[PDB]
Structure formats: C-alpha cells, structure tokens
JSON list of C-alpha atoms (C1' of nucleotides) in Angstrom, two decimals:
[
{"chain": "A", "resi": 1, "resn": "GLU", "atom": "CA", "xyz": [-59.01, 65.19, 7.26]},
{"chain": "A", "resi": 2, "resn": "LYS", "atom": "CA", "xyz": [-58.54, 61.45, 6.76]},
{"chain": "A", "resi": 3, "resn": "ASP", "atom": "CA", "xyz": [-55.43, 61.91, 4.63]},
{"chain": "A", "resi": 4, "resn": "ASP", "atom": "CA", "xyz": [-54.16, 64.65, 6.94]},
{"chain": "A", "resi": 5, "resn": "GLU", "atom": "CA", "xyz": [-54.68, 62.48, 10.03]},
{"chain": "A", "resi": 6, "resn": "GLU", "atom": "CA", "xyz": [-52.90, 59.53, 8.42]},
{"chain": "A", "resi": 7, "resn": "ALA", "atom": "CA", "xyz": [-50.08, 61.88, 7.41]},
{"chain": "A", "resi": 8, "resn": "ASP", "atom": "CA", "xyz": [-49.57, 63.33, 10.88]},
{"chain": "A", "resi": 9, "resn": "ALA", "atom": "CA", "xyz": [-49.74, 59.86, 12.43]},
{"chain": "A", "resi": 10, "resn": "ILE", "atom": "CA", "xyz": [-47.02, 58.73, 10.00]},
{"chain": "A", "resi": 11, "resn": "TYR", "atom": "CA", "xyz": [-44.89, 61.80, 10.74]},
{"chain": "A", "resi": 12, "resn": "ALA", "atom": "CA", "xyz": [-45.26, 61.39, 14.51]},
{"chain": "A", "resi": 13, "resn": "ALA", "atom": "CA", "xyz": [-44.21, 57.76, 14.06]},
{"chain": "A", "resi": 14, "resn": "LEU", "atom": "CA", "xyz": [-41.16, 58.96, 12.13]},
{"chain": "A", "resi": 15, "resn": "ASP", "atom": "CA", "xyz": [-40.25, 61.48, 14.84]},
{"chain": "A", "resi": 16, "resn": "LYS", "atom": "CA", "xyz": [-40.55, 58.96, 17.68]},
{"chain": "A", "resi": 17, "resn": "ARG", "atom": "CA", "xyz": [-38.60, 56.40, 15.63]},
{"chain": "A", "resi": 18, "resn": "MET", "atom": "CA", "xyz": [-35.83, 58.97, 15.24]},
{"chain": "A", "resi": 19, "resn": "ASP", "atom": "CA", "xyz": [-35.93, 59.84, 18.95]},
{"chain": "A", "resi": 20, "resn": "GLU", "atom": "CA", "xyz": [-35.62, 56.09, 19.65]},
{"chain": "A", "resi": 21, "resn": "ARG", "atom": "CA", "xyz": [-31.86, 56.39, 19.01]},
{"chain": "A", "resi": 22, "resn": "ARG", "atom": "CA", "xyz": [-31.17, 57.51, 22.59]},
{"chain": "A", "resi": 23, "resn": "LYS", "atom": "CA", "xyz": [-34.70, 57.30, 23.99]},
{"chain": "A", "resi": 24, "resn": "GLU", "atom": "CA", "xyz": [-33.90, 54.98, 26.90]},
{"chain": "A", "resi": 25, "resn": "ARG", "atom": "CA", "xyz": [-30.77, 56.79, 28.08]},
{"chain": "A", "resi": 26, "resn": "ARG", "atom": "CA", "xyz": [-32.20, 60.28, 27.49]},
{"chain": "A", "resi": 27, "resn": "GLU", "atom": "CA", "xyz": [-35.39, 59.45, 29.39]},
{"chain": "A", "resi": 28, "resn": "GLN", "atom": "CA", "xyz": [-33.39, 57.85, 32.22]},
{"chain": "A", "resi": 29, "resn": "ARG", "atom": "CA", "xyz": [-31.17, 60.92, 32.56]},
{"chain": "A", "resi": 30, "resn": "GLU", "atom": "CA", "xyz": [-34.19, 63.25, 32.40]},
{"chain": "A", "resi": 31, "resn": "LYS", "atom": "CA", "xyz": [-36.00, 61.25, 35.09]},
{"chain": "A", "resi": 32, "resn": "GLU", "atom": "CA", "xyz": [-32.90, 61.24, 37.29]},
{"chain": "A", "resi": 33, "resn": "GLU", "atom": "CA", "xyz": [-32.28, 64.95, 36.66]},
{"chain": "B", "resi": 1, "resn": "A", "atom": "C1'", "xyz": [-0.58, 12.99, -2.75]},
{"chain": "B", "resi": 2, "resn": "C", "atom": "C1'", "xyz": [-7.89, 11.57, -1.84]},
{"chain": "B", "resi": 3, "resn": "U", "atom": "C1'", "xyz": [-12.77, 13.70, 0.58]},
{"chain": "B", "resi": 4, "resn": "C", "atom": "C1'", "xyz": [-16.50, 17.66, 4.05]},
{"chain": "B", "resi": 5, "resn": "U", "atom": "C1'", "xyz": [-17.29, 22.82, 6.10]},
{"chain": "B", "resi": 6, "resn": "G", "atom": "C1'", "xyz": [-16.71, 27.90, 5.81]},
{"chain": "B", "resi": 7, "resn": "G", "atom": "C1'", "xyz": [-17.81, 32.26, 0.72]},
{"chain": "B", "resi": 8, "resn": "U", "atom": "C1'", "xyz": [-18.28, 37.09, -1.45]},
{"chain": "B", "resi": 9, "resn": "U", "atom": "C1'", "xyz": [-21.62, 41.04, -2.68]},
{"chain": "B", "resi": 10, "resn": "U", "atom": "C1'", "xyz": [-26.22, 43.75, -1.80]},
{"chain": "B", "resi": 11, "resn": "C", "atom": "C1'", "xyz": [-31.02, 45.44, 0.84]},
{"chain": "B", "resi": 12, "resn": "U", "atom": "C1'", "xyz": [-33.63, 45.56, 5.46]},
{"chain": "B", "resi": 13, "resn": "C", "atom": "C1'", "xyz": [-34.37, 44.76, 10.79]},
{"chain": "B", "resi": 14, "resn": "U", "atom": "C1'", "xyz": [-32.70, 44.04, 16.26]},
{"chain": "B", "resi": 15, "resn": "U", "atom": "C1'", "xyz": [-29.19, 44.78, 20.16]},
{"chain": "B", "resi": 16, "resn": "C", "atom": "C1'", "xyz": [-24.47, 46.35, 22.51]},
{"chain": "B", "resi": 17, "resn": "A", "atom": "C1'", "xyz": [-20.63, 49.72, 22.09]},
{"chain": "B", "resi": 18, "resn": "G", "atom": "C1'", "xyz": [-16.21, 55.60, 26.95]},
{"chain": "B", "resi": 19, "resn": "A", "atom": "C1'", "xyz": [-13.13, 52.01, 21.22]},
{"chain": "B", "resi": 20, "resn": "U", "atom": "C1'", "xyz": [-9.11, 58.38, 17.90]},
{"chain": "B", "resi": 21, "resn": "C", "atom": "C1'", "xyz": [-16.71, 54.25, 18.51]},
{"chain": "B", "resi": 22, "resn": "G", "atom": "C1'", "xyz": [-15.01, 59.77, 14.13]},
{"chain": "B", "resi": 23, "resn": "C", "atom": "C1'", "xyz": [-6.41, 59.86, 12.40]},
{"chain": "B", "resi": 24, "resn": "A", "atom": "C1'", "xyz": [-12.88, 64.36, 11.90]},
{"chain": "B", "resi": 25, "resn": "U", "atom": "C1'", "xyz": [-15.31, 67.68, 14.96]},
{"chain": "B", "resi": 26, "resn": "A", "atom": "C1'", "xyz": [-21.11, 71.00, 15.11]},
{"chain": "B", "resi": 27, "resn": "A", "atom": "C1'", "xyz": [-25.41, 73.12, 17.95]},
{"chain": "B", "resi": 28, "resn": "A", "atom": "C1'", "xyz": [-28.68, 73.77, 22.21]},
{"chain": "B", "resi": 29, "resn": "U", "atom": "C1'", "xyz": [-29.68, 73.74, 27.60]},
{"chain": "B", "resi": 30, "resn": "C", "atom": "C1'", "xyz": [-28.17, 73.98, 32.85]},
{"chain": "B", "resi": 31, "resn": "U", "atom": "C1'", "xyz": [-24.46, 75.06, 36.60]},
{"chain": "B", "resi": 32, "resn": "U", "atom": "C1'", "xyz": [-19.78, 77.52, 38.20]},
{"chain": "B", "resi": 33, "resn": "U", "atom": "C1'", "xyz": [-16.00, 80.91, 37.42]},
{"chain": "B", "resi": 34, "resn": "C", "atom": "C1'", "xyz": [-14.43, 85.50, 36.80]},
{"chain": "B", "resi": 35, "resn": "G", "atom": "C1'", "xyz": [-15.16, 89.54, 33.40]},
{"chain": "B", "resi": 36, "resn": "C", "atom": "C1'", "xyz": [-18.48, 94.18, 32.70]},
{"chain": "B", "resi": 37, "resn": "A", "atom": "C1'", "xyz": [-19.53, 86.40, 27.32]},
{"chain": "B", "resi": 38, "resn": "C", "atom": "C1'", "xyz": [-19.19, 85.46, 19.36]},
{"chain": "B", "resi": 39, "resn": "U", "atom": "C1'", "xyz": [-14.85, 88.04, 20.11]},
{"chain": "B", "resi": 40, "resn": "A", "atom": "C1'", "xyz": [-14.22, 83.13, 27.59]},
{"chain": "B", "resi": 41, "resn": "A", "atom": "C1'", "xyz": [-12.87, 79.02, 30.39]},
{"chain": "B", "resi": 42, "resn": "A", "atom": "C1'", "xyz": [-14.59, 74.67, 33.44]},
{"chain": "B", "resi": 43, "resn": "G", "atom": "C1'", "xyz": [-18.34, 70.67, 34.59]},
{"chain": "B", "resi": 44, "resn": "A", "atom": "C1'", "xyz": [-22.83, 68.12, 33.22]},
{"chain": "B", "resi": 45, "resn": "U", "atom": "C1'", "xyz": [-27.04, 66.86, 30.04]},
{"chain": "B", "resi": 46, "resn": "U", "atom": "C1'", "xyz": [-29.33, 66.73, 25.31]},
{"chain": "B", "resi": 47, "resn": "U", "atom": "C1'", "xyz": [-29.84, 66.86, 19.90]},
{"chain": "B", "resi": 48, "resn": "C", "atom": "C1'", "xyz": [-27.68, 66.36, 15.37]},
{"chain": "B", "resi": 49, "resn": "C", "atom": "C1'", "xyz": [-23.98, 64.79, 11.16]},
{"chain": "B", "resi": 50, "resn": "G", "atom": "C1'", "xyz": [-22.37, 58.70, 10.82]},
{"chain": "B", "resi": 51, "resn": "U", "atom": "C1'", "xyz": [-19.89, 54.56, 12.57]},
{"chain": "B", "resi": 52, "resn": "G", "atom": "C1'", "xyz": [-18.12, 49.58, 14.49]},
{"chain": "B", "resi": 53, "resn": "G", "atom": "C1'", "xyz": [-19.39, 44.39, 16.86]},
{"chain": "B", "resi": 54, "resn": "A", "atom": "C1'", "xyz": [-22.92, 40.61, 17.14]},
{"chain": "B", "resi": 55, "resn": "G", "atom": "C1'", "xyz": [-27.51, 38.49, 15.76]},
{"chain": "B", "resi": 56, "resn": "A", "atom": "C1'", "xyz": [-31.84, 37.93, 12.29]},
{"chain": "B", "resi": 57, "resn": "G", "atom": "C1'", "xyz": [-34.28, 38.11, 7.55]},
{"chain": "B", "resi": 58, "resn": "G", "atom": "C1'", "xyz": [-34.36, 39.06, 2.23]},
{"chain": "B", "resi": 59, "resn": "A", "atom": "C1'", "xyz": [-31.59, 38.33, -2.90]},
{"chain": "B", "resi": 60, "resn": "A", "atom": "C1'", "xyz": [-27.05, 38.07, -6.69]},
{"chain": "B", "resi": 61, "resn": "C", "atom": "C1'", "xyz": [-23.17, 34.77, -8.31]},
{"chain": "B", "resi": 62, "resn": "A", "atom": "C1'", "xyz": [-18.72, 31.60, -6.86]},
{"chain": "B", "resi": 63, "resn": "A", "atom": "C1'", "xyz": [-18.32, 27.34, -5.29]},
{"chain": "B", "resi": 64, "resn": "C", "atom": "C1'", "xyz": [-12.84, 24.32, -2.91]},
{"chain": "B", "resi": 65, "resn": "U", "atom": "C1'", "xyz": [-7.21, 29.31, -4.01]},
{"chain": "B", "resi": 66, "resn": "C", "atom": "C1'", "xyz": [-7.31, 30.16, 1.05]},
{"chain": "B", "resi": 67, "resn": "U", "atom": "C1'", "xyz": [-8.79, 28.85, 6.62]},
{"chain": "B", "resi": 68, "resn": "G", "atom": "C1'", "xyz": [-9.15, 24.05, 8.45]},
{"chain": "B", "resi": 69, "resn": "A", "atom": "C1'", "xyz": [-10.59, 19.17, 9.27]},
{"chain": "B", "resi": 70, "resn": "G", "atom": "C1'", "xyz": [-11.40, 13.99, 7.94]},
{"chain": "B", "resi": 71, "resn": "U", "atom": "C1'", "xyz": [-7.03, 11.17, 5.29]},
{"chain": "B", "resi": 72, "resn": "C", "atom": "C1'", "xyz": [14.15, 6.47, -0.57]},
{"chain": "B", "resi": 73, "resn": "C", "atom": "C1'", "xyz": [17.62, 3.30, 6.02]},
{"chain": "B", "resi": 74, "resn": "A", "atom": "C1'", "xyz": [21.66, -4.77, 6.38]},
{"chain": "B", "resi": 75, "resn": "A", "atom": "C1'", "xyz": [28.58, -3.71, 7.37]},
{"chain": "B", "resi": 76, "resn": "U", "atom": "C1'", "xyz": [30.25, 0.37, 14.75]},
{"chain": "B", "resi": 77, "resn": "U", "atom": "C1'", "xyz": [25.31, 5.19, 16.95]},
{"chain": "B", "resi": 78, "resn": "U", "atom": "C1'", "xyz": [20.01, 2.30, 17.98]},
{"chain": "B", "resi": 79, "resn": "U", "atom": "C1'", "xyz": [15.59, -1.75, 13.61]},
{"chain": "B", "resi": 80, "resn": "U", "atom": "C1'", "xyz": [18.77, -6.90, 9.98]},
{"chain": "B", "resi": 81, "resn": "U", "atom": "C1'", "xyz": [22.91, -9.54, 16.04]},
{"chain": "B", "resi": 82, "resn": "G", "atom": "C1'", "xyz": [27.94, -12.01, 19.38]},
{"chain": "B", "resi": 83, "resn": "A", "atom": "C1'", "xyz": [24.11, -14.83, 19.45]},
{"chain": "B", "resi": 84, "resn": "G", "atom": "C1'", "xyz": [24.38, -19.66, 22.11]},
{"chain": "B", "resi": 85, "resn": "G", "atom": "C1'", "xyz": [26.68, -24.00, 24.96]},
{"chain": "B", "resi": 86, "resn": "C", "atom": "C1'", "xyz": [29.64, -25.97, 30.25]},
{"chain": "B", "resi": 87, "resn": "C", "atom": "C1'", "xyz": [30.36, -25.79, 35.96]},
{"chain": "B", "resi": 88, "resn": "U", "atom": "C1'", "xyz": [28.76, -24.41, 41.71]},
{"chain": "B", "resi": 89, "resn": "U", "atom": "C1'", "xyz": [25.58, -22.80, 45.53]},
{"chain": "B", "resi": 90, "resn": "G", "atom": "C1'", "xyz": [20.04, -21.23, 47.96]},
{"chain": "B", "resi": 91, "resn": "C", "atom": "C1'", "xyz": [15.34, -22.69, 46.67]},
{"chain": "B", "resi": 92, "resn": "U", "atom": "C1'", "xyz": [13.34, -26.52, 43.48]},
{"chain": "B", "resi": 93, "resn": "U", "atom": "C1'", "xyz": [6.76, -23.96, 41.36]},
{"chain": "B", "resi": 94, "resn": "U", "atom": "C1'", "xyz": [11.91, -30.98, 39.88]},
{"chain": "B", "resi": 95, "resn": "G", "atom": "C1'", "xyz": [10.03, -26.69, 34.62]},
{"chain": "B", "resi": 96, "resn": "G", "atom": "C1'", "xyz": [14.17, -24.43, 36.32]},
{"chain": "B", "resi": 97, "resn": "C", "atom": "C1'", "xyz": [14.96, -19.33, 38.60]},
{"chain": "B", "resi": 98, "resn": "A", "atom": "C1'", "xyz": [19.14, -15.92, 41.04]},
{"chain": "B", "resi": 99, "resn": "A", "atom": "C1'", "xyz": [24.54, -14.77, 41.35]},
{"chain": "B", "resi": 100, "resn": "G", "atom": "C1'", "xyz": [29.36, -16.03, 40.07]},
{"chain": "B", "resi": 101, "resn": "G", "atom": "C1'", "xyz": [33.07, -18.84, 37.31]},
{"chain": "B", "resi": 102, "resn": "C", "atom": "C1'", "xyz": [33.67, -20.15, 32.28]},
{"chain": "B", "resi": 103, "resn": "U", "atom": "C1'", "xyz": [33.94, -21.93, 26.39]},
{"chain": "B", "resi": 104, "resn": "A", "atom": "C1'", "xyz": [32.91, -19.87, 22.11]}
]
RNA sequence: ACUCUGGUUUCUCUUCAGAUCGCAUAAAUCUUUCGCACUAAAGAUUUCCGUGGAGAGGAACAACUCUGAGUCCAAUUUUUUGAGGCCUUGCUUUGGCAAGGCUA
C-alpha cells in the first residue's frame, strides 16, 4: 500500500545509509576479489 | 603598567584515520594446515558494538583569567672627560691632512 511502500522505501534508505559506513572499501574489495 | 583576537557547552551533517583508532575485544565467510574442528591454529575479507582529527551548519551563556599580539646609573670598567695648545717633514684640495717630537 501507499503507507507500506513509503515505509519500505524509508527502511531501505536506512539500510543503505548504514551500509555506507564501509561501502566504498567493501565494494572495492568485493570487486577485486 | 593601556588596547584587539581566540571561548565554553550542546545538536546535526561531511570527510580522513593501520593511531592500544578501543589500556577493551564479538560474529560470519573463504583459504591452508593438520586432526578424525566449540572443546584448533594460521592468513585474508566482511559485518557489528563505538571512537579520534579536520571541516560545515544549528543554538545556550561567558566574554578578556589564560594563549597571544598591538603597546631607580656624574668620582677608575664603558654614557657626565685629560680634554686642548707648540715644533718638523711629504703633499698643500693654501682649509689643512699624515707621522713623529713635545707642553699641559
């Protein structure tokens, strides 16, 4: 629903914001590995 | 001994950090090693708990402590005198200079 979609968008934003802590280095190591 | 900065606290955001970033210490994955892997070691990666530095924004009271900067000597030894006057020579830039001999 509208509220549900807004909620999951917010929660996905929260999760990617948290993963932003080491996003660059983690993604670089994963690409290299 | 006179004047001008810088404050401190709190909330949020951005970046860097192999520094005991943390006077503490988890978990997962992959590889290797031997056992035969909670009762086991090594290497690497990741995620978590949560930090310091710098920068930026917000808002609460202290504003010159501190960090800075701009702002009493006459008696030997130094700055309260042994100073000035005469004579010769080389050259006179004819003002006298240089050296020596003097008198005080």
